[PDB]
Design an enzyme around this catalytic site. Structure first.
Site, mmCIF file in Angstrom:
data_model
loop_
_atom_site.group_PDB
_atom_site.id
_atom_site.type_symbol
_atom_site.label_atom_id
_atom_site.label_comp_id
_atom_site.label_asym_id
_atom_site.label_seq_id
_atom_site.Cartn_x
_atom_site.Cartn_y
_atom_site.Cartn_z
ATOM 1 N N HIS A 21 0.660 -1.178 0.032
ATOM 2 C CA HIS A 21 0.022 -0.039 0.122
ATOM 3 C C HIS A 21 0.876 1.373 -0.089
ATOM 4 O O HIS A 21 0.315 2.280 0.017
ATOM 5 C CB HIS A 21 -0.952 0.093 1.253
ATOM 6 C CG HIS A 21 -0.279 0.174 2.382
ATOM 7 N ND1 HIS A 21 -0.447 -0.660 3.667
ATOM 8 C CD2 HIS A 21 -0.033 1.667 3.066
ATOM 9 C CE1 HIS A 21 0.046 0.109 4.783
ATOM 10 N NE2 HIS A 21 0.251 1.159 4.482
ATOM 11 N N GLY A 46 2.656 6.234 9.488
ATOM 12 C CA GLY A 46 3.911 6.399 9.014
ATOM 13 C C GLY A 46 4.641 5.070 9.745
ATOM 14 O O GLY A 46 5.907 4.497 9.414
ATOM 15 N N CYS A 59 4.036 1.817 9.379
ATOM 16 C CA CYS A 59 3.893 0.763 8.479
ATOM 17 C C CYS A 59 5.028 0.291 8.233
ATOM 18 O O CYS A 59 6.024 1.149 7.633
ATOM 19 C CB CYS A 59 2.799 0.863 7.562
ATOM 20 S SG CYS A 59 0.969 1.113 7.963
HETATM 21 C C1 LIG Z 1 0.873 2.760 8.081
HETATM 22 O O1 LIG Z 1 1.780 3.623 8.243
HETATM 23 C C2 LIG Z 1 -0.252 3.145 8.696
HETATM 24 C C3 LIG Z 1 -0.586 2.934 9.942
HETATM 25 C C4 LIG Z 1 -1.774 3.263 10.829
HETATM 26 C C5 LIG Z 1 -2.446 4.601 10.700
HETATM 27 C C6 LIG Z 1 -3.036 4.949 12.146
HETATM 28 N N1 LIG Z 1 -2.309 3.936 12.980
HETATM 29 C C7 LIG Z 1 -1.862 2.925 12.316
HETATM 30 O O2 LIG Z 1 -1.512 1.848 12.676
HETATM 31 N N2 LIG Z 1 -1.685 2.391 8.116
HETATM 32 C C8 LIG Z 1 -2.445 2.849 7.149
HETATM 33 O O3 LIG Z 1 -2.188 3.875 6.511
HETATM 34 C C9 LIG Z 1 -3.777 2.096 6.928
HETATM 35 C C10 LIG Z 1 -3.886 1.470 5.531
HETATM 36 C C11 LIG Z 1 -4.411 0.307 5.203
HETATM 37 C C12 LIG Z 1 -5.763 0.381 4.701
HETATM 38 C C13 LIG Z 1 -3.705 -0.711 4.345
HETATM 39 N N3 LIG Z 1 -4.984 2.559 7.239
HETATM 40 C C14 LIG Z 1 -5.037 2.183 8.514
HETATM 41 O O4 LIG Z 1 -4.605 1.671 9.363
HETATM 42 C C15 LIG Z 1 -6.739 2.733 9.234
HETATM 43 C C16 LIG Z 1 -6.639 3.743 10.006
HETATM 44 C C17 LIG Z 1 -7.855 3.963 10.496
HETATM 45 C C18 LIG Z 1 -8.974 3.537 10.182
HETATM 46 C C19 LIG Z 1 -9.242 2.476 9.304
HETATM 47 C C20 LIG Z 1 -9.910 1.758 9.155
HETATM 48 C C21 LIG Z 1 -10.077 0.522 8.003
HETATM 49 C C22 LIG Z 1 -8.899 0.143 7.621
HETATM 50 N N4 LIG Z 1 -7.860 0.880 8.097
HETATM 51 C C23 LIG Z 1 -7.456 1.904 8.656
#
Ligand SMILES: *C(=O)[C@H](C[C@@H]1CCNC1=O)NC(=O)[C@H](CC(C)C)NC(=O)c1cccc2cccnc12
Ligand SMILES: *C(=O)[C@H](C[C@@H]1CCNC1=O)NC(=O)[C@H](CC(C)C)NC(=O)c1cccc2cccnc12
Lengths: 306, 306
Positions: free
Chosen positions: A41, A143, A145
């Site tokens: 992603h 960030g 990830c």
């Molecule tokens: C990675 O850098 C980031 C970490 C997240 C951001 C908030 N805390 C974390 O652990 N991940 C993302 O950007 C991530 C992308 C996924 C969809 C591949 N999105 C999420 O983690 C995220 C955040 C809030 C709400 C939701 C709902 C459904 C899916 N993903 C969500």
């Protein structure tokens, strides 16, 4: 004596963390030999994350659209491929700090250390467990990830987790290093059910053995039980069923403390049925399940790495 | 989101740990530039530890009676001196992995990461706090001595603690890197009173702000209080008194959450007077005081090192 939620020394993993940038998106990558591993992603925009066709998105990208930075220096990407939910970026230079390593897919209940990173730099290290419902209760910000979970064995690092997502309910989900999610989750910004979490019974028992080793044993009762009788109580309180395997794995702690596993089960039964009554065990007012029997033996015998 | 008891990445400290042997005694040393630092009780036998005259013991020792090993390789000791309760072994080679470093003597209430080592090899890393009574509740076995506590700031490691002793009551005591014990303790196998421990009020408040940031806020009440009124309640429950300094230091968390410090004090007051009533805060059923306001800001903003 004493008992802490101890993480592995992170030094070997620190030297592997890099920053991967694609378009406006930046996240962490893991640089091992001449391959960088990161969440796929990375190629997305905030818009794309609602409903990504990863095949279609990756097709628009070339080698030069991936900036990999290890400190000040750029790595040159001479190849890219998508394995499940991870992107593999072949680079021209081998990581000179590559440790002896394995990729492992761990089971529910097992534990590992997370090295939380941002922009390819570590922020901290903590120990956590793969929940029965294949989530983790981590500490992850935007960030984070690409951050990895791992175990060490002497000098060999076993990578088990890469962080991809925080669910709407604030819990965390990710993949193995082959990019296969733990649990049913997908890398899409959509509502996703984790399902009923359960307490890792064998880990609670391990932790109770730790408690006895460290002199905390007020909870030791006069009762015993059977595996079936215990399990009846387990299901009621959302505990995983206890198998003879789990009993077998607790053998060493049972041998060290001279407490039969089913006697500790009876003690645990009483703690579940009566509560902890205002007292504490190893500084905790609830039943800890993030310590495997192996973790207890490691900690209480001072096993070293390097 | 999420909140963990996070330790600093240990890599910079890993590369400094060495094994120091004298007679039959072995423990950990810290190798910085061309000096190795270790507890002076390395020169003792089990007999000597009852009532050591460290001056008299050290006089019997020469440079060659100190074996320092970094991995496979021996360091040659060309000098030795005793500074307070630490021994400084001048060696002929500078540690090529020496990080930018400071020695600091931290205050009660402050936090640091411990790298628990045995035979100069790390076993694990955990975060802990210097208790008000100048003890720490660590995880230390025989041979853990010389292990260090530290903080990192970008690329600078601040060493604050060296482990010397477990008290009869199973709690841990040590020195700064100039070898001056934290608290009244001496390096002698004798019964030693730690004195009344107190809860680090400002840290509890910090942790409550962390809890609100992460969506956990059932404990937020309708009440406010004064610093004096709060302090009356503090003394009753063995909490450190809250100063305007502590209020000032909480300012950032108060600004981020829009909750005045004295309103959070009222909430804390109610938790102390009424208990937690079976509920939890950030996965804990008691009031955590091992997070400084700085720790909360670090964790919740993803501050990095290297
Ligand atoms: C990675 O850098 C980031 C970490 C997240 C951001 C908030 N805390 C974390 O652990 N991940 C993302 O950007 C991530 C992308 C996924 C969809 C591949 N999105 C999420 O983690 C995220 C955040 C809030 C709400 C939701 C709902 C459904 C899916 N993903 C969500
Ligand atoms: C260091 O390697 C070792 C660590 C101890 C051993 C048990 N857990 C630890 O943290 N320290 C010592 O050998 C130490 C020596 C002191 C006196 C300088 N002894 C103790 O830590 C110790 C252990 C048990 C009881 C007492 C009582 C009084 C003083 N020291 C004690």
């Amino acid at each position: 004596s004493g008992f802490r939620k101890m993480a592995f020394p992170s030094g070997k993993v620190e030297g592997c963390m890099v920053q991967v940038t694609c378009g406006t998106t930046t996240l962490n990558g893991l640089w091992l030999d001449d391959v960088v591993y990161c969440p796929r992603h990375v190629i997305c925009t905030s818009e794309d994350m609602l409903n990504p066709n990863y095949e279609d998105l990756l097709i628009r990208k070339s080698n030069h659209n991936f900036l990999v930075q290890a400190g000040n220096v750029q790595l040159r990407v001479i190849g890219h491929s998508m394995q499940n939910c991870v992107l593999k970026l072949k680079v021209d230079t081998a990581n000179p700090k590559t440790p002896k390593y394995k990729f492992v897919r761990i089971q529910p209940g097992q534990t590992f250390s997370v090295l939380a990173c941002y922009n390819g730099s570590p922020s901290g290290v903590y120990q956590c467990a793969m929940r029965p419902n294949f989530t983790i209760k981590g500490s992850f910000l935007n960030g984070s990830c690409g951050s990895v979970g791992f175990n060490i064995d002497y000098d060999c690092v076993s990578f088990c987790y890469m962080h991809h997502m925080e669910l709407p309910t604030g819990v965390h989900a990710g993949t193995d290093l082959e990019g296969n999610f733990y649990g049913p989750f997908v890398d899409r910004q959509t509502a996703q059910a984790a399902g009923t979490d359960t307490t890792i019974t064998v880990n609670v028992l391990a932790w109770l053995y730790a408690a006895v080793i460290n002199g905390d044993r007020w909870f030791l009762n006069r009762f015993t039980t059977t595996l079936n009788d215990f399990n009846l109580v387990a299901m009621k309180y959302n505990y995983e069923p206890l198998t003879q395997d789990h009993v077998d794995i607790l053998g060493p702690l049972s041998a060290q403390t001279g407490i039969a596993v089913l006697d500790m089960c009876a003690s645990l039964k009483e703690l579940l049925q009566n509560g902890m009554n205002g007292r504490t065990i190893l500084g905790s007012a609830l039943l800890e399940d993030e310590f495997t029997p192996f973790d207890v033996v490691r900690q209480c015998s001072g096993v070293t790495f390097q």
